Amino acid sequence: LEAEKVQAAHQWREDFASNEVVYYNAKDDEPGSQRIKPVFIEDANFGRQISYQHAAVHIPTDIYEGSTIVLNELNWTSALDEVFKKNREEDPSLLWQVFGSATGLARYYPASPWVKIDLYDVRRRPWYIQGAASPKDMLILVDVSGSVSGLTLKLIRTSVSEMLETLSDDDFVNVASFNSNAQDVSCFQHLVQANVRNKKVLKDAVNNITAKGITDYKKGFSFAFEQLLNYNVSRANCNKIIMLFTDGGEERAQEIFNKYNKDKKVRVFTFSVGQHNYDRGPIQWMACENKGYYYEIPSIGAIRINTQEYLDVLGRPMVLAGDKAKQVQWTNVYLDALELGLVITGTLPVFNITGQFENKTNLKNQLILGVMGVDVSLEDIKRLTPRFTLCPNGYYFAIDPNGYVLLHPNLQPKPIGVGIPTIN
């Protein structure tokens, strides 16, 4: 409520030299932005050095600070520090509070220096994705025809392996492929729960595809629409989306789209991968008729950004809901990036409501500003369930509405394994 109000009053200004921005960059030991040097007193609860006077900012290494987008975000996200301290003062046991912005920068309190190559991005974190959109029913279509052989195949294989990393245990996914005959890549044949084990099978099967044959969009899309109309197995009964990983072509497949989704209840996201000279006209047409988006991946560096921007389209119905879409969600147990052990994180999306009192913006107000976040460590929950009164054989445990244990004596602060490790 104090991020929607401050953002609305913000005035978009393009000159940052005469009026510098003061903030603490988390990953540091510049005209247009001033930097703070904190005191960093050691404190308990956390296992590091923190400063309770200001909030730190993390900016991804490929996101340039000093841009007109980042610097504009660093002013209206400065009244958050006064709400960060009020929350801490009322509840001294408060752990990390964080604002993951859609620009890419995460502002968290209390300030603490960031932990080889930093590949962290707040827009790919499990707690950000779960609040940026509703659960989905992704079905990936991969073009494995002859024209995609070579560099554009290893870019497709990496891209599919990177969008599977944006799917949680509440989403359902399957990967298909068409080379003049549509088939599955794995042993599944229908949508699976997309947990850690199932996604490993799809990733291993995707790495083993070979490019050979004739491109046929009609047969591939007929297979995709058939797999999204199963209803015999467990599903999400939510966002039904199709990702088409191709390079280019001359086929629009307008007959298939008029046969399977005349009401346009299934979104189609189309990706053009690699450097080529094939027509991208039909590829962009499937993304505009069907309520999707079109993305281009010309190299390895564009894989990460382009495979996570489909959540901006999926969040459009969530913003138009209004106050009904503001529900706190708790993620699964995961390990904190700033090492703190096993934690769960609360989540609340933030909307862009500039010009709301005038009732005519509807231009960038359909996207979210970011996702709120507050971390609760499993040790805090374990303190609310005293144990020493019971026998050594007695214990508590709690589970998700999935079977996953929130707290259990056999739950260790280590990642779960999904096969035999190997080294090449």
Partner: peptide, 6 residues
């Protein structure tokens, strides 16, 4: 567990 080989 100790890593394997490939």
């Amino acid at each position: 567990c100790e890593p394997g080989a490939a």
